[PDB]
């Protein structure tokens, strides 16, 4: 039998440096995890031990820390090249800076193939981008070859900034002819590597004939066989076995996010490329694995420009930015309005004639606003200032919530009002009125929301059965601050851009800001 | 006796081309007026006839039409040079593009001295600007000399964008030592030429010893002796005679605005420079005076770039911009919100630690909004589109109004509601609630206004005795649409930037706009 070791990462999201256990800034180095220097050590060890190894990335290296803000993907090409990745699939966040911000730096500087079989281009863009990403690549491994076929979320236009040329086709529709073509070319071992989420990965494994293994991403899915090694709770076994329409057992793998784990799957193939067995588990990249000294020194050199950038003026405020708890946990505060306005601006995506924008609404836990910003330093705002306001390393995510769920969230926002607790919500595109003399659970007396399916945005009463798109912190989408109804009742959840980066980009665009308290939240 | 003819303009405000009678776009050429080509004809005729002539401008050539938007003052230098102006005083609007936008093009390209004795600079700016404007200039006229001493409104920091280096000193304090210095230099004929308004001009004439004549501007003051030749109603005789503290009769002149009139004052001096007599009148530059063919051909050449600019994309909207009368004369409309937000943005000026901005409030007659803009032309907005919304050639001015006056204005806004009349007000920085079941004059049931003397902008109830700064159309400041209370009760009025230009600059800054209807105006 011919044995292949697949090493894989996904949704690394700019975690070039080692992180804390929750993937935020590393504080106590002796307990930090991940980072490319530590990944290098582990990949190198495995490559000494196993003859046939592929190192694959399932997309979403772009977006997540100041590394991406400053280097804009050059850091991804550089450090993925240093790790000698064998292939990468395009994720949604690879389009965050447009097709131009993908072509340069990433596609032109990567030394490995970058893959997606379900993205097509038209017009001059088609000639400009031709061959810079590929539907698949056939790679030599030892004396054999392995075909790797890529895919990218069909929902990317709602989750990034790909522009209006590119078309994202249905994954299974695009993948099947490519896999059948590879069979006709005597390629009998085929990995589907792509960025659509665990649920789509399972459908691909079931329905795309000829796929031997699916290596996925997007949903930050943690899979494990046995007692998990850290705090992440598995969604299923590793690999997750799908029975294909033609009776084969097809392993599906993912490796959480943020570079905390290295996926590791061993597959045994027979001479005809049939899978005999598959087993493995993600490896927790904890501090027992040393950071490679040379990669670490390179990381530290690249960090200089990040430190320099962090104190540069992004823009100016002419108003005090009130991010105090005494305001933001008790009433509408202008820092909350600013952040929610930045959240909505970040989520402006190309729209049909059916909506002015696909999302208009924002909620933000006031306890997640951690500092004011004083305007008396010549109005200057720096990244360092914003990192004091938003220190948790979160993202501003997109969810779909029924109106009934959102109303329950606003009741939860004030269910124990008066104690300076974090669940009090700041808002955008929502006007709420509370009557605190009513019983907890019945304190929301008016709740109006900004329309999306309208050419002139205006407010209408919230409807209990209607499903609304809302931008909110990952922390809330995951049920933080007691918002269990959000986690349990949401209909869709996609991870968005880094919290600081969302606000920094908006301030830079606006140049001079003056957010007011304007009646988004009132008390009767 | 030595006779001097003073020809003078002020507040031309970018009216390079001939205009209609009300100084807007020329439509029926046979009845149009003003423009530099016609001015050239008349100045040339007078210079053939009178031996001792000075042609003076009292400031505010900058700002008013697409000419300034595109050429940014190069048109002022070019055409004032062609007319051979002898001197110009700096007005407030010469600072609209900052000191940088004054130095280049105007100060470096004018072939005549540009004057202001009450503006001082510090730091590197002082070395950069030294000598490019002057406190005064002594000019030879025939066999005599005449000193011209300049001044500029002390209020310029609130009425333009001069920056924080320059200091505008009290006019009389700065002028007196310069005039006394000229006396010691054997200059016995002295004109004060400046840009502070008719009231300050009268104080200068009264109190600055040695000033023989004051040539002013800023307040668009029309003075005339006899039956006026057009629709402007005189504020007093021409010249307006002030008796100085030392007993002399000092003529004060101004010549309205917009290039419609050429001021013309004849002064007889004795051998010691005492004024024996003064008489004259502004000359209406009507169609009986031919436009100079060569200046006109030059104007038409320069117009090509304006026509080209007028169809270029300024920015994008992703929402329909509802400037329909059915919306904007009946309720809050998003085009009204956009325009008022642009008005407030245009009036962001440097502020003490005593206010976040000196003005926060805006009113706009809905009848002054003349078209929607459809978003389905790839979202594009052009100057031509904005000129359809705002076709009247107005300005967005700064006034001071007591709260009682503003409340009366909002009652007037709905006093005959339901007839699609123009007085219905769109707003910014004001939240109003009407109850139309109440009697006219008693329909405003809530009126809250955005604070200025606050570090965090928020709304408070309007106070009847407090004086508020408000940005509103010139048309309303002058009592249009029946707002006689505004004209009669306002405490301060200064002319602002061109209406289209205010909106165009804001759209260009924002890049992508999406104004909502958000509850600034409600009905109970
Ligand atoms: N990861 C996180 N992301 C966003 N908000 C968070 C996160 N962790 C905690 N918070 C916020 O921080 C609040 C707790 O704040 P404090 O009362 O100041 C106590 P402390 O900061 O010591 O936890 C929570 O209620 C929540 O709103
Ligand atoms: N110079 C102006 N500046 C601003 N608004 C003006 C001016 N002249 C007229 N308007 C507006 O135009 C309105 C009249 O509009 P319509 O009912 O459409 C009749 P018409 O346009 O024929 O005068 C006035 O009530 C006022 O709001
Ligand atoms: Ca196979
Ligand atoms: Ca004299
Ligand atoms: Na999924
Ligand atoms: Na005046
Ligand atoms: Zn991701
Ligand atoms: Zn993703
Ligand atoms: Zn003026
Ligand atoms: Zn002026």
PDB file of N, CA and C in Angstrom, chain B residues 349-410:
ATOM      1  N   UNK B 349     -15.008  73.669  11.282  1.00  0.00           N
ATOM      2  CA  UNK B 349     -13.945  74.648  11.383  1.00  0.00           C
ATOM      3  C   UNK B 349     -13.181  74.357  12.658  1.00  0.00           C
ATOM      4  N   UNK B 350     -12.000  74.936  12.779  1.00  0.00           N
ATOM      5  CA  UNK B 350     -11.204  74.652  13.963  1.00  0.00           C
ATOM      6  C   UNK B 350     -11.916  75.155  15.212  1.00  0.00           C
ATOM      7  N   UNK B 351     -11.893  74.336  16.246  1.00  0.00           N
ATOM      8  CA  UNK B 351     -12.675  74.570  17.445  1.00  0.00           C
ATOM      9  C   UNK B 351     -11.768  74.609  18.658  1.00  0.00           C
ATOM     10  N   UNK B 352     -12.121  75.478  19.608  1.00  0.00           N
ATOM     11  CA  UNK B 352     -11.548  75.468  20.943  1.00  0.00           C
ATOM     12  C   UNK B 352     -11.816  74.128  21.615  1.00  0.00           C
ATOM     13  N   UNK B 353     -11.371  73.994  22.852  1.00  0.00           N
ATOM     14  CA  UNK B 353     -11.864  72.925  23.701  1.00  0.00           C
ATOM     15  C   UNK B 353     -13.263  73.222  24.228  1.00  0.00           C
ATOM     16  N   UNK B 354     -13.870  74.327  23.788  1.00  0.00           N
ATOM     17  CA  UNK B 354     -15.208  74.725  24.204  1.00  0.00           C
ATOM     18  C   UNK B 354     -16.319  74.170  23.321  1.00  0.00           C
ATOM     19  N   UNK B 355     -16.013  73.674  22.125  1.00  0.00           N
ATOM     20  CA  UNK B 355     -17.031  73.032  21.304  1.00  0.00           C
ATOM     21  C   UNK B 355     -16.381  71.981  20.414  1.00  0.00           C
ATOM     22  N   UNK B 356     -17.155  70.952  20.054  1.00  0.00           N
ATOM     23  CA  UNK B 356     -16.633  69.990  19.084  1.00  0.00           C
ATOM     24  C   UNK B 356     -16.626  70.600  17.687  1.00  0.00           C
ATOM     25  N   UNK B 357     -17.626  71.429  17.392  1.00  0.00           N
ATOM     26  CA  UNK B 357     -17.668  72.273  16.207  1.00  0.00           C
ATOM     27  C   UNK B 357     -18.557  73.455  16.539  1.00  0.00           C
ATOM     28  N   UNK B 358     -18.305  74.593  15.881  1.00  0.00           N
ATOM     29  CA  UNK B 358     -19.057  75.789  16.247  1.00  0.00           C
ATOM     30  C   UNK B 358     -20.508  75.734  15.798  1.00  0.00           C
ATOM     31  N   UNK B 359     -20.840  74.877  14.832  1.00  0.00           N
ATOM     32  CA  UNK B 359     -22.207  74.761  14.334  1.00  0.00           C
ATOM     33  C   UNK B 359     -22.544  73.286  14.148  1.00  0.00           C
ATOM     34  N   UNK B 360     -23.788  72.937  14.458  1.00  0.00           N
ATOM     35  CA  UNK B 360     -24.260  71.562  14.386  1.00  0.00           C
ATOM     36  C   UNK B 360     -25.595  71.391  13.681  1.00  0.00           C
ATOM     37  N   UNK B 361     -26.241  72.480  13.252  1.00  0.00           N
ATOM     38  CA  UNK B 361     -27.641  72.475  12.868  1.00  0.00           C
ATOM     39  C   UNK B 361     -27.821  73.026  11.462  1.00  0.00           C
ATOM     40  N   UNK B 362     -28.829  72.486  10.775  1.00  0.00           N
ATOM     41  CA  UNK B 362     -29.086  72.763   9.370  1.00  0.00           C
ATOM     42  C   UNK B 362     -30.581  72.731   9.125  1.00  0.00           C
ATOM     43  N   UNK B 363     -31.090  73.708   8.357  1.00  0.00           N
ATOM     44  CA  UNK B 363     -32.437  73.650   7.797  1.00  0.00           C
ATOM     45  C   UNK B 363     -32.375  73.961   6.306  1.00  0.00           C
ATOM     46  N   UNK B 364     -33.315  73.387   5.565  1.00  0.00           N
ATOM     47  CA  UNK B 364     -33.295  73.410   4.101  1.00  0.00           C
ATOM     48  C   UNK B 364     -34.734  73.337   3.603  1.00  0.00           C
ATOM     49  N   UNK B 365     -35.184  74.342   2.846  1.00  0.00           N
ATOM     50  CA  UNK B 365     -36.527  74.281   2.276  1.00  0.00           C
ATOM     51  C   UNK B 365     -36.648  73.142   1.269  1.00  0.00           C
ATOM     52  N   UNK B 366     -37.640  72.280   1.482  1.00  0.00           N
ATOM     53  CA  UNK B 366     -37.851  71.152   0.578  1.00  0.00           C
ATOM     54  C   UNK B 366     -38.142  71.567  -0.848  1.00  0.00           C
ATOM     55  N   UNK B 367     -38.749  72.738  -1.030  1.00  0.00           N
ATOM     56  CA  UNK B 367     -38.951  73.267  -2.362  1.00  0.00           C
ATOM     57  C   UNK B 367     -37.677  73.642  -3.085  1.00  0.00           C
ATOM     58  N   UNK B 368     -36.553  73.710  -2.375  1.00  0.00           N
ATOM     59  CA  UNK B 368     -35.274  73.970  -2.991  1.00  0.00           C
ATOM     60  C   UNK B 368     -34.554  72.741  -3.481  1.00  0.00           C
ATOM     61  N   UNK B 369     -35.158  71.573  -3.293  1.00  0.00           N
ATOM     62  CA  UNK B 369     -34.635  70.300  -3.759  1.00  0.00           C
ATOM     63  C   UNK B 369     -35.444  69.966  -4.997  1.00  0.00           C
ATOM     64  N   UNK B 370     -34.792  69.910  -6.150  1.00  0.00           N
ATOM     65  CA  UNK B 370     -35.511  69.999  -7.419  1.00  0.00           C
ATOM     66  C   UNK B 370     -35.477  68.744  -8.275  1.00  0.00           C
ATOM     67  N   UNK B 371     -34.797  67.688  -7.842  1.00  0.00           N
ATOM     68  CA  UNK B 371     -34.749  66.449  -8.605  1.00  0.00           C
ATOM     69  C   UNK B 371     -34.293  65.332  -7.692  1.00  0.00           C
ATOM     70  N   UNK B 372     -34.721  64.104  -7.941  1.00  0.00           N
ATOM     71  CA  UNK B 372     -34.012  62.947  -7.391  1.00  0.00           C
ATOM     72  C   UNK B 372     -32.764  62.650  -8.220  1.00  0.00           C
ATOM     73  N   UNK B 373     -31.975  61.699  -7.719  1.00  0.00           N
ATOM     74  CA  UNK B 373     -30.891  61.092  -8.474  1.00  0.00           C
ATOM     75  C   UNK B 373     -31.058  59.588  -8.381  1.00  0.00           C
ATOM     76  N   UNK B 374     -31.205  58.948  -9.536  1.00  0.00           N
ATOM     77  CA  UNK B 374     -31.339  57.505  -9.623  1.00  0.00           C
ATOM     78  C   UNK B 374     -29.977  56.852  -9.446  1.00  0.00           C
ATOM     79  N   UNK B 375     -29.958  55.774  -8.662  1.00  0.00           N
ATOM     80  CA  UNK B 375     -28.744  55.036  -8.353  1.00  0.00           C
ATOM     81  C   UNK B 375     -28.412  53.969  -9.385  1.00  0.00           C
ATOM     82  N   UNK B 376     -29.252  53.781 -10.402  1.00  0.00           N
ATOM     83  CA  UNK B 376     -29.095  52.650 -11.306  1.00  0.00           C
ATOM     84  C   UNK B 376     -28.190  52.946 -12.501  1.00  0.00           C
ATOM     85  N   UNK B 377     -27.519  54.098 -12.520  1.00  0.00           N
ATOM     86  CA  UNK B 377     -26.483  54.384 -13.517  1.00  0.00           C
ATOM     87  C   UNK B 377     -25.112  54.031 -12.935  1.00  0.00           C
ATOM     88  N   UNK B 378     -25.000  52.763 -12.528  1.00  0.00           N
ATOM     89  CA  UNK B 378     -23.802  52.251 -11.860  1.00  0.00           C
ATOM     90  C   UNK B 378     -23.497  53.035 -10.582  1.00  0.00           C
ATOM     91  N   UNK B 379     -24.528  53.625  -9.993  1.00  0.00           N
ATOM     92  CA  UNK B 379     -24.381  54.440  -8.803  1.00  0.00           C
ATOM     93  C   UNK B 379     -23.791  55.813  -9.035  1.00  0.00           C
ATOM     94  N   UNK B 380     -23.381  56.130 -10.262  1.00  0.00           N
ATOM     95  CA  UNK B 380     -22.646  57.363 -10.528  1.00  0.00           C
ATOM     96  C   UNK B 380     -23.457  58.599 -10.165  1.00  0.00           C
ATOM     97  N   UNK B 381     -22.777  59.578  -9.562  1.00  0.00           N
ATOM     98  CA  UNK B 381     -23.277  60.933  -9.380  1.00  0.00           C
ATOM     99  C   UNK B 381     -22.300  61.889 -10.054  1.00  0.00           C
ATOM    100  N   UNK B 382     -22.827  62.796 -10.877  1.00  0.00           N
ATOM    101  CA  UNK B 382     -22.039  63.825 -11.541  1.00  0.00           C
ATOM    102  C   UNK B 382     -22.485  65.202 -11.068  1.00  0.00           C
ATOM    103  N   UNK B 383     -21.636  66.189 -11.361  1.00  0.00           N
ATOM    104  CA  UNK B 383     -21.980  67.575 -11.080  1.00  0.00           C
ATOM    105  C   UNK B 383     -23.270  67.954 -11.787  1.00  0.00           C
ATOM    106  N   UNK B 384     -23.422  67.519 -13.035  1.00  0.00           N
ATOM    107  CA  UNK B 384     -24.645  67.781 -13.788  1.00  0.00           C
ATOM    108  C   UNK B 384     -25.878  67.250 -13.052  1.00  0.00           C
ATOM    109  N   UNK B 385     -25.785  66.045 -12.478  1.00  0.00           N
ATOM    110  CA  UNK B 385     -26.889  65.530 -11.669  1.00  0.00           C
ATOM    111  C   UNK B 385     -27.191  66.458 -10.495  1.00  0.00           C
ATOM    112  N   UNK B 386     -26.149  66.873  -9.766  1.00  0.00           N
ATOM    113  CA  UNK B 386     -26.354  67.754  -8.618  1.00  0.00           C
ATOM    114  C   UNK B 386     -26.930  69.107  -9.021  1.00  0.00           C
ATOM    115  N   UNK B 387     -26.540  69.627 -10.194  1.00  0.00           N
ATOM    116  CA  UNK B 387     -27.092  70.889 -10.669  1.00  0.00           C
ATOM    117  C   UNK B 387     -28.582  70.781 -10.972  1.00  0.00           C
ATOM    118  N   UNK B 388     -29.078  69.578 -11.276  1.00  0.00           N
ATOM    119  CA  UNK B 388     -30.521  69.395 -11.408  1.00  0.00           C
ATOM    120  C   UNK B 388     -31.210  69.423 -10.056  1.00  0.00           C
ATOM    121  N   UNK B 389     -30.548  68.904  -9.014  1.00  0.00           N
ATOM    122  CA  UNK B 389     -31.121  68.941  -7.677  1.00  0.00           C
ATOM    123  C   UNK B 389     -31.127  70.368  -7.139  1.00  0.00           C
ATOM    124  N   UNK B 390     -30.076  71.134  -7.453  1.00  0.00           N
ATOM    125  CA  UNK B 390     -29.801  72.445  -6.865  1.00  0.00           C
ATOM    126  C   UNK B 390     -29.497  73.419  -7.994  1.00  0.00           C
ATOM    127  N   UNK B 391     -30.531  73.951  -8.638  1.00  0.00           N
ATOM    128  CA  UNK B 391     -30.354  74.721  -9.880  1.00  0.00           C
ATOM    129  C   UNK B 391     -30.369  76.230  -9.708  1.00  0.00           C
ATOM    130  N   UNK B 392     -30.470  76.730  -8.476  1.00  0.00           N
ATOM    131  CA  UNK B 392     -30.762  78.140  -8.253  1.00  0.00           C
ATOM    132  C   UNK B 392     -29.524  79.007  -8.073  1.00  0.00           C
ATOM    133  N   UNK B 393     -28.343  78.416  -7.974  1.00  0.00           N
ATOM    134  CA  UNK B 393     -27.148  79.209  -7.800  1.00  0.00           C
ATOM    135  C   UNK B 393     -27.027  79.819  -6.425  1.00  0.00           C
ATOM    136  N   UNK B 394     -27.513  79.131  -5.394  1.00  0.00           N
ATOM    137  CA  UNK B 394     -27.513  79.671  -4.053  1.00  0.00           C
ATOM    138  C   UNK B 394     -26.276  79.294  -3.279  1.00  0.00           C
ATOM    139  N   UNK B 395     -26.248  79.755  -2.033  1.00  0.00           N
ATOM    140  CA  UNK B 395     -25.182  79.440  -1.103  1.00  0.00           C
ATOM    141  C   UNK B 395     -25.804  78.891   0.172  1.00  0.00           C
ATOM    142  N   UNK B 396     -24.998  78.144   0.910  1.00  0.00           N
ATOM    143  CA  UNK B 396     -25.401  77.599   2.202  1.00  0.00           C
ATOM    144  C   UNK B 396     -24.703  78.446   3.257  1.00  0.00           C
ATOM    145  N   UNK B 397     -25.481  79.336   3.872  1.00  0.00           N
ATOM    146  CA  UNK B 397     -24.994  80.428   4.699  1.00  0.00           C
ATOM    147  C   UNK B 397     -25.054  80.064   6.173  1.00  0.00           C
ATOM    148  N   UNK B 398     -24.335  80.846   6.974  1.00  0.00           N
ATOM    149  CA  UNK B 398     -24.303  80.690   8.421  1.00  0.00           C
ATOM    150  C   UNK B 398     -25.072  81.838   9.063  1.00  0.00           C
ATOM    151  N   UNK B 399     -26.053  81.507   9.900  1.00  0.00           N
ATOM    152  CA  UNK B 399     -26.808  82.520  10.627  1.00  0.00           C
ATOM    153  C   UNK B 399     -26.842  82.168  12.108  1.00  0.00           C
ATOM    154  N   UNK B 400     -27.126  83.186  12.920  1.00  0.00           N
ATOM    155  CA  UNK B 400     -27.429  83.013  14.335  1.00  0.00           C
ATOM    156  C   UNK B 400     -28.892  83.370  14.565  1.00  0.00           C
ATOM    157  N   UNK B 401     -29.640  82.433  15.157  1.00  0.00           N
ATOM    158  CA  UNK B 401     -31.069  82.560  15.414  1.00  0.00           C
ATOM    159  C   UNK B 401     -31.371  82.190  16.857  1.00  0.00           C
ATOM    160  N   UNK B 402     -32.174  83.015  17.537  1.00  0.00           N
ATOM    161  CA  UNK B 402     -32.734  82.591  18.816  1.00  0.00           C
ATOM    162  C   UNK B 402     -33.608  81.352  18.630  1.00  0.00           C
ATOM    163  N   UNK B 403     -33.674  80.525  19.678  1.00  0.00           N
ATOM    164  CA  UNK B 403     -34.552  79.367  19.626  1.00  0.00           C
ATOM    165  C   UNK B 403     -35.995  79.729  19.318  1.00  0.00           C
ATOM    166  N   UNK B 404     -36.477  80.850  19.861  1.00  0.00           N
ATOM    167  CA  UNK B 404     -37.846  81.276  19.567  1.00  0.00           C
ATOM    168  C   UNK B 404     -38.052  81.487  18.070  1.00  0.00           C
ATOM    169  N   UNK B 405     -37.069  82.092  17.394  1.00  0.00           N
ATOM    170  CA  UNK B 405     -37.144  82.294  15.948  1.00  0.00           C
ATOM    171  C   UNK B 405     -37.168  80.963  15.210  1.00  0.00           C
ATOM    172  N   UNK B 406     -36.297  80.044  15.616  1.00  0.00           N
ATOM    173  CA  UNK B 406     -36.248  78.749  14.958  1.00  0.00           C
ATOM    174  C   UNK B 406     -37.552  77.978  15.167  1.00  0.00           C
ATOM    175  N   UNK B 407     -38.135  78.049  16.372  1.00  0.00           N
ATOM    176  CA  UNK B 407     -39.434  77.411  16.590  1.00  0.00           C
ATOM    177  C   UNK B 407     -40.495  78.018  15.681  1.00  0.00           C
ATOM    178  N   UNK B 408     -40.503  79.344  15.534  1.00  0.00           N
ATOM    179  CA  UNK B 408     -41.450  79.965  14.609  1.00  0.00           C
ATOM    180  C   UNK B 408     -41.217  79.489  13.181  1.00  0.00           C
ATOM    181  N   UNK B 409     -39.959  79.274  12.806  1.00  0.00           N
ATOM    182  CA  UNK B 409     -39.667  78.753  11.475  1.00  0.00           C
ATOM    183  C   UNK B 409     -40.250  77.356  11.305  1.00  0.00           C
ATOM    184  N   UNK B 410     -40.115  76.496  12.318  1.00  0.00           N
ATOM    185  CA  UNK B 410     -40.693  75.163  12.179  1.00  0.00           C
ATOM    186  C   UNK B 410     -42.219  75.179  12.183  1.00  0.00           C
TER     187      UNK B 410
END
